[PDB]
Amino acid sequence: VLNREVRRTGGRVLITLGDQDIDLSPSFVIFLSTRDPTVEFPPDLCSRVT
Amino acid sequence: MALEEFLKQIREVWNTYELDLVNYQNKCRLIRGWDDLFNKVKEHINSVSAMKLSPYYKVFEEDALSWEDKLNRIMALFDVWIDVQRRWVYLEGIFTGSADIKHLLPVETQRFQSISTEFLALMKKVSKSPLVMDVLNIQGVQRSLERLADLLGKIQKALGEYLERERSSFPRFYFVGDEDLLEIIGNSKNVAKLQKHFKKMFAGVSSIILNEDNSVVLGISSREGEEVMFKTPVSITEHPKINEWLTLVEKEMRVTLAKLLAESVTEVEIFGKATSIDPNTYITWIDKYQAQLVVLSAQIAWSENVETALSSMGGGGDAAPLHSVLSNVEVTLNVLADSVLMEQPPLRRRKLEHLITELVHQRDVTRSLIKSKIDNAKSFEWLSQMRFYFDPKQTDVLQQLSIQMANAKFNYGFEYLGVQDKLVQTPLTDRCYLTMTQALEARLGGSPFGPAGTGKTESVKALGHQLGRFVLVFNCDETFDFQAMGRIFVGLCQVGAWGCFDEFNRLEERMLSAVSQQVQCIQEALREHSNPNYDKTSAPITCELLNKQVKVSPDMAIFITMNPGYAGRSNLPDNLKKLFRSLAMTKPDRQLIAQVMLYSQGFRTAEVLANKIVPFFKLCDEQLSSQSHYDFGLRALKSVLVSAGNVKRERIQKIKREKEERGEAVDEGEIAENLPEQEILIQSVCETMVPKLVAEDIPLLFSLLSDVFPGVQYHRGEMTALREELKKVCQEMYLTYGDGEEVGGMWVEKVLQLYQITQINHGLMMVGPSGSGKSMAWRVLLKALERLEGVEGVAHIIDPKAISKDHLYGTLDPNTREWTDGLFTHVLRKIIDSVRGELQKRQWIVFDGDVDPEWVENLNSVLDDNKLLTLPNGERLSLPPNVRIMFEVQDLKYATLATVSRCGMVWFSEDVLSTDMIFNNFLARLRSIPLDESPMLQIQRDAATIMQPYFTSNGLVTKALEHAFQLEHIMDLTRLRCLGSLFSMLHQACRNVAQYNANHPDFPMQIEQLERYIQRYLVYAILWSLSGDSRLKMRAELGEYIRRITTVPLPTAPNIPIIDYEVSISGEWSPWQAKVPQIEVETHKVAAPDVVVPTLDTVRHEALLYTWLAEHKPLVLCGPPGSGKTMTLFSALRALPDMEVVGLNFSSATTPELLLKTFDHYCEYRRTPNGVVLAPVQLGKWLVLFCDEINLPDMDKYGTQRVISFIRQMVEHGGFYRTSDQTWVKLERIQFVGACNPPTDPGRKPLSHRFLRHVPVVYVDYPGPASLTQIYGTFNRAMLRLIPSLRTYAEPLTAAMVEFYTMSQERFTQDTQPHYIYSPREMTRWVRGIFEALRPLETLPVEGLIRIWAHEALRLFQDRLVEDEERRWTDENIDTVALKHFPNIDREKAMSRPILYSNWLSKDYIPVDQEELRDYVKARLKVFYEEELDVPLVLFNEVLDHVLRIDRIFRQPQGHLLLIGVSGAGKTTLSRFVAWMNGLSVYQIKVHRKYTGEDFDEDLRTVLRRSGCKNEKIAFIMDESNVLDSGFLERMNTLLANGEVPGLFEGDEYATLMTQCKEGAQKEGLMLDSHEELYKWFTSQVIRNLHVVFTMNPSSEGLKDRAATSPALFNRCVLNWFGDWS
Amino acid sequence: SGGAKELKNIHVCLGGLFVPEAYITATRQYVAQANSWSLEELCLEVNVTTSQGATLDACSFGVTGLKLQGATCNNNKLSLSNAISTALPLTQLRWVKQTN
Amino acid sequence: GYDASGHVEDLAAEQNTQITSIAIGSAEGFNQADKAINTAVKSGRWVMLKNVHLAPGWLMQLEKKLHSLQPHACFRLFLTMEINPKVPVNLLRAGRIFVF
Amino acid sequence: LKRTVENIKDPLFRFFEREVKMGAKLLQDVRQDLADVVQVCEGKKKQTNY
Ligand SMILES: Nc1ncnc2c1ncn2[C@@H]1O[C@H](COP(=O)(O)OP(=O)(O)OP(=O)(O)O)[C@@H](O)[C@H]1O
Ligand SMILES: Nc1ncnc2c1ncn2[C@@H]1O[C@H](COP(=O)(O)OP(=O)(O)O)[C@@H](O)[C@H]1O
Ligand SMILES: Nc1ncnc2c1ncn2[C@@H]1O[C@H](COP(=O)(O)OP(=O)(O)O)[C@@H](O)[C@H]1O
Ligand SMILES: Nc1ncnc2c1ncn2[C@@H]1O[C@H](COP(=O)(O)OP(=O)(O)O)[C@@H](O)[C@H]1O
Ligand SMILES: [Mg+2]
Ligand SMILES: [Mg+2]
């Protein structure tokens, strides 16, 4: 989801969540939050978020 | 003719031998007489086995074999029958005598009903035909008994909650195991079987006394034999239920002890305050009452005497009758000393010793009181003393005695204590008593702390026993968790007993915190007991434990003895520590204890002896050298003093025995007067301390003895008969026996030393470097004792560090609280139960392995005076007197002071086992044991005759070994590794002579040819056994030294080392170069994984490997990665048919479980009359376990690798322990080959010397420039026959490769980056890559070939580089080497820097323009966006190069990628795009927060089913973030290296895999039905189809740890450093 | 160079020794063996010299490097001091028969 | 060497307020702590958890649980711990620290 | 120190023998270690794990 790995096939936009594919609506948006300012994030998570 | 007599006797025995039956409760006829039946079967089996040795056995072979079979079948059936019967018995008693269990457990009751129905039908069938033969002929009786055993066991494990509910009734059952509790409950009627369990439930009750009917309990007995008669007997008939009459027995025991004390006091009061004591009346009084009661009465009488004196002195200035109390104690002590000087019955002697100790304390206290002018009974220096007030007017007998110390007051518990050792009452002991009694009065726990061996545990036990309390010691470890501690607390609270937890800081800190609240609530319950407001006629005091309301008896206490000085111990939280009162116990009074013990044992010079022995121990501690196995503490002195007492008694007995045969003037007083007490003490000191000393310390300790004990000499008793028995055993085991200074004399002395250590210590260690004759010493001692004493000796050898501690000691189930025995627990419990007469045999439990505090400290209560193994389920197992705990170790650098002080010591030096002894052993086995399975024996005897002159003292081999120790070797050098390699090579030479005789049946080899062959082969074998693990220059050094010192003829070549020669069977030195022809390789297997170019190193290493392997000797190949170790081993195995190799790839996390899974797949376990045998599934085949990284697996903090210990156990002992049922499994047709890098490499650990002594090591270095030129020169000549016009370029191209490779191997090393390893593997890949780019080409100019060469160099060398300057250097030096070896070419057409090759724009892999490739990649990404992933990508040059590299790797079998770069660089996206370009399905594991190892295993099974069964090409793309555990990487390492996971498919999964592989192989047109062949095909399909792409971020520490964690990732995967965007 | 008898005359810095306890016990054992006494029958007397290199009795051993913390020693006479450490030039340890 | 659990117990005794005290080490300790906190937040009851520094991972989840909670005004949660770097920073910021 | 039949009876010689033995062992180990470190720092011998 954070990588925006969408598959557009058969007029359908699919996002693969776990083992299940879901029709992704264009109006979806996600905000990740934390209350700890000192938490360290791994570089892979840092590359996928703003 | 006598053999037929033996067969006839066996036939007549079993034609009439009937199993003996006995009526059981009119319910059936059970079988008794097990010992007789088993002994008869065993001795007939022994006779049948022995008659095979006779040369007349053949005529009677068949029948004899038949009988053997029958005997074994018998030995099968009844070996089950008994257990079944035993179990059934108590199970029946449980399902018939209790009607509540039927409603409580209906399903279990009905299951047991069916089981008992079948059991009784079998009983009736046995009753009709009691003959053993017909019982054995019952149809399916074996399977019937096996099924009955399984079913009865299941019912047993089902009855657990019933066991708990019954434990609630009689709380002492809380300290009895489930097996024993079932046996007690089910055998309530047959009370005799209860006897063995009383010592579990009582402090001193070892057995109960029963009337003739066995229906009335008349009294109780101790282990020694002391008996107490109940004042009123307890009738079992009146109270049939077992817990009821057990409670009555306990109450009557307490009341009887109270009444006996009431009588003992009123009789001893006469002895007190009396001027003179008649010895006869005194000794009669001591004999009349129990030792506990006698000491208690003496303490009382002294107490009221002192009270009367102090009350009389209330006037202050009045006369002091305290002197009269002193005088009475003096007179009584004089009588006691006079008694102990003369011989006494042992029980009476121990009573006298206890009386002496107590009255010595009383004398000291009275002297202190008189010295300080004490005249008031309320003064504290009297109140601080422990006082005893007895009030006969008290109505309750249990309350007549009160024990008071300071303000603390206690009631005597009246627990029967039997006869127990009582401590010397030292000032430290007085302080301990005072502090602990103050803690008890405050309802606080006690906490003695200090270094090991100071008396903490003993002091707590002595305090409890002085109060008549049942004291229970627990050897705490990390498995004593919250629930186990809670259950133990419940048991002690309901019983009212004292709990002493030693090593209590070995619990986890969280568990200590959790246990604190149980301790707090129990302490509150004790305080409500103290509350006077509380009345005894009210609700019983109760606290909440484990969410249950548990009654708390006021007599219980909780004590913890610990050592804060040990590092790694858990710190106690403050809230826990405030619940305990702590006392430091650091400096025990050694002199006082020594004096009191010597005075009580009867030594007249006790003062002088103690004043000499204690400073002697100090001088031994300080003057003698420092060794880890040295202890001169309180335990050592205590052992010496007890031994001195024993030696004094045996010397008095010997003196009177000599007097019997010389007159009759036997006066015990005269013997006491003329008795060498100092000589006795010297004898004890020597027998206890001499075996532990190193050679240089023995004269030091003798000089100390002369200094402290002048004129006293110690002489060992000449133990002849034992020495002839050991000599016979040495003769029959090919061992060297010597006497004194002869060869083997030191080892024989060490054997004798171990013998007298076994007679004084139940726990002992033999410590000495690997190869010191230790194992042979104890084994030969065991056999000699078996022959001399008639007692069968059985040894259980455990490698405690080859298994987990849970598998060693056992596990308490977290949920069901069910206990599973460990290996040592199971063995000791089997010995204790004595189902098959284990208690009548000598039982030696030998821990042959490394000692560390984690596992050995669980034996602290076993090795000390407790002799108890304490388990976290509250069970304690007593060590039987016939059991010795032994440790066979090479060092003790990780053992602590407690373990060292808790075990006798025998030190073995390297000088104990001389090299001549080893040579004699080898030559004796050569001359006696034939190698074939006699002409072969004749050949061996002749070879031994030839080799004997070189195997003498200061001979050829000894000098060679001495010189080789000075040489440098890739591993540590040990004597036995070289000697074993040499002996195996000589055995191979004997087999070579035999095979030559086979080739020439007409003219066998003569003696002269044999001599010339054997001498040269001995030189050759010495060379390869002493320098085969070293580099070339060391080999030349050893060879030239041999040339200097040898008389054997040698090659006359001037500058060629002897190591370059073999020995032909005609006894001539022939150069190895004669077996290295210049081969021309067929063009289609150029640089193939199987092709090997013959070289001097290849031919020599292959021959040595053949020699070691054909003997099944385990071996290790060591060398730099890519040195050709695996290649050489496979080449050697190709010359060995009937050998199947199986490759295991070790990582840092490798455990024995990998080997176990490999055995599960490739081998089978089978029952044989001699045990479990693990053998390869394929018959007639020897299986080689090839471990590729044997020295990588993690070394723990105590220097032990578990898998190395396990492999050592398999190699030396021929097997291991199956931990599911704790059974010994013997290996058959399984050998071991390991490969490794030098231990100095990062992540590599040195191998244990005990492992190396069995394992010859061969050093395989990188091929030198000439060898590389020759090998790859042949490859190039083979490959460039594709284009004839390029033939003349074979030599330059190879040269170029070599030069560049060499330069690369110099420019980039592991110091810079952990993955900068370059080996001939790069050269092989270079040749293969050029060859693949040449096959479909009809012609090519030289510039095109140079372009291919440069492109392959860039792919192989530059792609792994991290820094830009390294890549620049590689790029420039490619041009440099290219133009150095290939002049007269156009530079631009061959070295145009954008060197790109592809097969995307053409059928063939040809150079591709960057712009055309860019257009093609854009066109393909256009389709890729709409078909797989709609993520637009910006396309730059590095992306094009990266996708070309990924395509190259995806077009190779087992093509695995290690993409290292910053996150977000597009590694995964590019991998998926290239996989889509190649028709590869992309697989990624869907990691979530709850993703575990089982999920990864299922994903691996899915991907392997798709890749190996469905022939689907899958790119398994996985990131480092996907690795949630190290097991993921352990699975991935094996999958990368071999394309198979040994344990991934098990059970139904394996059957489904077999079905799918069958249906997939039938689709491929192959005829495969066998599971092995189908699995091999599946592995090959996985190899060719699956491509693993590992993605990870650059991290120096992370990458370095990654190399050790998953080695295959750096040698089976192509590494691509994408890094960050430039 | 001189034999083992020269070990008794040499002054020893107790701190430099790896195990000074063993040195003290060895000196006690030496004195007890010279007079055929026991270790427990010897008591230790301490003499502090103004300068090193003094007359060593057969039962006396020289020790250097001892640092007196909290006191000063004049004429084998201790007095309370406000200084942290005071160097003791040479300490003669003499093992003599105990008169209790 | 110092422990403030006794201070909390004495404080609860003086205020005549009931308090449940739990050691944190055991898993049953975790379950009892959760139940006691859930009961106390609805009744003003006092909860004390001792040696919480031994369970930092559980401490983070405890902080997250406490953040989304509106307990009774009289409810008080005491967390006794050693001065340990393993204690989570978020818990330290959420609560008020007293050094003993 | 050289062991002698009459030197073994001297407690001072015994203690000093222990002293000199352990001191010589430690001295040899430390000197060899420092020489190896020097040779490493001159780029003449390869760095082992120890
Ligand atoms: N008395 C003897 N005379 C000759 N050879 C002997 C004698 N005793 C043992 N050996 C041989 O010498 C070797 C001694 O092996 P042993 O197992 O006794 O040594 P160890 O010190 O216990 O070994 P490890 O330290 O590996 O456990 C074996 O090869 C054995 O056969
Ligand atoms: N007062 C004493 N009298 C006699 N022997 C004692 C006495 N105190 C301790 N010991 C002995 O000291 C040894 C170690 O005692 P133990 O309780 O195991 O010490 P610790 O708990 O400090 O390891 C044992 O041999 C024990 O019998
Ligand atoms: N005589 C030879 N013939 C063919 N290849 C050789 C020869 N000597 C060395 N090699 C090469 O050396 C490398 C050895 O690889 P490998 O067997 O994995 O080494 P190791 O077992 O030391 O890790 C391969 O590239 C192999 O082709
Ligand atoms: N060449 C590229 N063009 C466009 N975006 C890219 C490119 N390489 C990486 N990215 C970015 O990185 C994201 C993740 O790509 P991925 O292959 O998962 O990277 P990595 O393997 O480095 O973790 C993409 O969704 C995109 O936002
Ligand atoms: Mg103890
Ligand atoms: Mg051994």
Side-chain angles (χ1 to χ4, degrees), chain A:
Chain A
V1 175
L2 309 191
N3 292 151
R4 276 177 226 280
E5 312 167 19
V6 298
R7 172 169 37 111
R8 285 168 174 116
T9 303
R12 284 170 74 220
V13 184
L14 271 292
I15 192 66
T16 303
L17 188 71
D19 63 305
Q20 162 210 30
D21 57 354
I22 308 176
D23 291 331
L24 175 62
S25 165
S27 46
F28 162 85
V29 64
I30 178 160
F31 300 89
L32 311 183
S33 51
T34 178
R35 290 184 292 107
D36 188 51
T38 81
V39 64
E40 316 262 10
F41 299 100
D44 63 358
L45 190 56
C46 297
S47 60
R48 315 175 197 240
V49 303
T50 296

Side-chain angles (χ1 to χ4, degrees), chain B residues 1067-1128:
Chain B
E1068 301 305 316
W1069 288 104
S1070 45
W1072 272 119
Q1073 199 68 59
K1075 291 188 183 165
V1076 179
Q1078 184 178 2
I1079 65 168
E1080 300 302 305
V1081 166
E1082 68 275 16
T1083 187
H1084 75 276
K1085 314 177 173 299
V1086 170
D1090 186 64
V1091 175
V1092 181
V1093 176
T1095 65
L1096 172 65
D1097 308 302
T1098 292
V1099 299
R1100 295 183 312 195
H1101 290 166
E1102 202 266 347
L1104 181 67
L1105 282 190
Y1106 190 97
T1107 285
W1108 293 342
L1109 282 156
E1111 294 294 329
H1112 313 308
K1113 181 88 162 176
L1115 64 89
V1116 172
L1117 307 101
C1118 192
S1123 61
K1125 293 178 293 298
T1126 298
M1127 176 191 62
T1128 304

Side-chain angles (χ1 to χ4, degrees), chain B residues 667-837:
Chain B
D667 172 58
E668 59 282 359
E670 180 182 1
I671 280 153
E673 296 294 357
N674 297 115
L675 184 63
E677 296 187 1
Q678 290 194 1
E679 190 196 5
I680 298 170
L681 183 63
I682 301 299
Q683 189 184 305
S684 298
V685 167
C686 299
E687 292 171 357
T688 287
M689 300 298 160
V690 164
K692 85 178 67 178
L693 299 177
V694 292
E696 61 90 3
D697 272 356
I698 319 184
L700 287 200
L701 187 150
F702 283 128
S703 296
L704 300 174
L705 286 170
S706 66
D707 284 3
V708 181
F709 303 88
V712 189
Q713 313 310 120
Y714 163 84
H715 315 89
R716 308 190 315 116
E718 182 65 26
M719 294 182 286
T720 61
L722 180 57
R723 296 180 78 120
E724 292 84 4
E725 288 293 0
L726 293 153
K727 192 185 321 177
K728 288 151 163 83
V729 170
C730 282
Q731 177 63 222
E732 61 86 20
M733 296 180 60
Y734 314 102
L735 291 194
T736 297
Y737 175 91
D739 270 354
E741 316 302 296
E742 310 164 2
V743 180
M746 293 165 69
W747 178 82
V748 171
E749 291 293 329
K750 283 301 167 173
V751 176
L752 298 173
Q753 289 178 1
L754 173 71
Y755 176 56
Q756 73 265 351
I757 301 290
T758 52
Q759 299 165 295
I760 290 154
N761 312 65
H762 60 269
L764 72 165
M765 292 180 183
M766 293 182 286
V767 187
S770 177
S772 295
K774 305 184 299 294
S775 304
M776 283 316 208
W778 72 256
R779 287 178 167 293
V780 166
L781 177 59
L782 192 59
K783 286 172 172 139
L785 295 174
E786 180 152 358
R787 293 180 181 177
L788 184 81
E789 295 178 353
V791 178
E792 169 182 355
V794 174
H796 309 265
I797 297 90
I798 298 177
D799 198 324
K801 292 288 290 271
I803 64 182
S804 66
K805 185 187 176 181
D806 291 331
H807 285 151
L808 180 61
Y809 294 114
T811 297
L812 202 46
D813 180 276
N815 316 301
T816 61
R817 305 314 281 170
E818 170 59 293
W819 172 256
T820 296
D821 270 359
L823 175 55
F824 171 73
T825 315
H826 164 85
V827 169
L828 171 61
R829 191 191 297 285
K830 208 192 201 327
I831 298 167
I832 296 163
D833 290 334
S834 194
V835 165
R836 303 172 181 66

Side-chain angles (χ1 to χ4, degrees), chain B residues 936-1215:
Chain B
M936 177 74 237
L937 201 42
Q938 198 39 37
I939 288 180
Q940 300 167 212
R941 289 204 172 128
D942 291 331
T945 309
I946 304 165
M947 296 187 291
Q948 185 87 63
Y950 308 98
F951 278 104
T952 72
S953 277
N954 277 329
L956 175 69
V957 184
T958 301
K959 293 183 183 293
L961 190 55
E962 208 270 335
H963 190 68
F965 272 94
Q966 276 78 81
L967 301 174
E968 293 83 3
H969 311 268
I970 207 59
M971 305 198 171
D972 285 352
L973 183 63
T974 59
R975 169 178 57 178
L976 288 189
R977 177 171 58 116
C978 294
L979 292 188
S981 175
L982 175 68
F983 301 154
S984 298
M985 288 189 72
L986 294 174
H987 289 158
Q988 182 52 51
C990 294
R991 290 174 200 277
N992 290 350
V993 179
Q995 189 274 331
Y996 171 98
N997 288 2
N999 302 352
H1000 305 71
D1002 167 51
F1003 291 155
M1005 185 180 288
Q1006 295 315 300
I1007 314 301
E1008 190 276 331
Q1009 184 178 182
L1010 185 55
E1011 175 161 38
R1012 269 186 308 111
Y1013 180 57
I1014 291 301
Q1015 293 179 356
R1016 305 184 208 271
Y1017 195 99
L1018 167 75
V1019 171
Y1020 164 86
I1022 285 171
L1023 279 169
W1024 282 107
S1025 303
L1026 274 54
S1027 69
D1029 74 324
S1030 74
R1031 71 185 172 271
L1032 176 77
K1033 182 174 72 68
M1034 305 282 84
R1035 295 176 177 174
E1037 182 65 26
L1038 183 59
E1040 66 182 2
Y1041 175 69
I1042 291 179
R1043 186 178 289 280
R1044 303 204 297 270
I1045 69 180
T1046 191
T1047 61
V1048 182
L1050 294 186
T1052 61
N1055 312 117
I1056 297 89
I1058 301 168
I1059 205 79
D1060 284 359
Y1061 283 88
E1062 65 182 1
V1063 187
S1064 60
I1065 194 65
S1066 71
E1068 301 305 316
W1069 288 104
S1070 45
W1072 272 119
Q1073 199 68 59
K1075 291 188 183 165
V1076 179
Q1078 184 178 2
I1079 65 168
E1080 300 302 305
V1081 166
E1082 68 275 16
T1083 187
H1084 75 276
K1085 314 177 173 299
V1086 170
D1090 186 64
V1091 175
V1092 181
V1093 176
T1095 65
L1096 172 65
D1097 308 302
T1098 292
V1099 299
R1100 295 183 312 195
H1101 290 166
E1102 202 266 347
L1104 181 67
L1105 282 190
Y1106 190 97
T1107 285
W1108 293 342
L1109 282 156
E1111 294 294 329
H1112 313 308
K1113 181 88 162 176
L1115 64 89
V1116 172
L1117 307 101
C1118 192
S1123 61
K1125 293 178 293 298
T1126 298
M1127 176 191 62
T1128 304
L1129 170 68
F1130 286 17
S1131 179
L1133 286 170
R1134 284 192 263 281
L1136 290 172
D1138 317 314
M1139 265 195 206
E1140 183 178 1
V1141 71
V1142 167
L1144 293 91
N1145 296 94
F1146 282 17
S1147 68
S1148 58
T1150 286
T1151 69
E1153 213 53 50
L1154 185 77
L1155 292 170
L1156 294 169
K1157 295 310 172 203
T1158 298
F1159 291 152
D1160 282 324
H1161 181 270
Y1162 294 94
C1163 299
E1164 49 173 77
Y1165 298 85
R1166 74 167 185 283
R1167 298 293 296 163
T1168 75
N1170 313 286
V1172 179
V1173 164
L1174 184 67
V1177 159
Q1178 295 298 109
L1179 308 200
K1181 295 286 208 223
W1182 269 79
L1183 188 153
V1184 188
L1185 294 174
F1186 177 38
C1187 312
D1188 199 9
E1189 303 285 353
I1190 201 162
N1191 65 335
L1192 284 180
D1194 281 329
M1195 188 148 278
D1196 64 359
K1197 58 173 70 172
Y1198 313 110
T1200 302
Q1201 291 163 112
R1202 179 180 298 176
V1203 70
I1204 299 303
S1205 297
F1206 189 78
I1207 301 172
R1208 175 192 177 241
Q1209 171 182 58
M1210 294 183 286
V1211 163
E1212 183 178 1
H1213 299 328

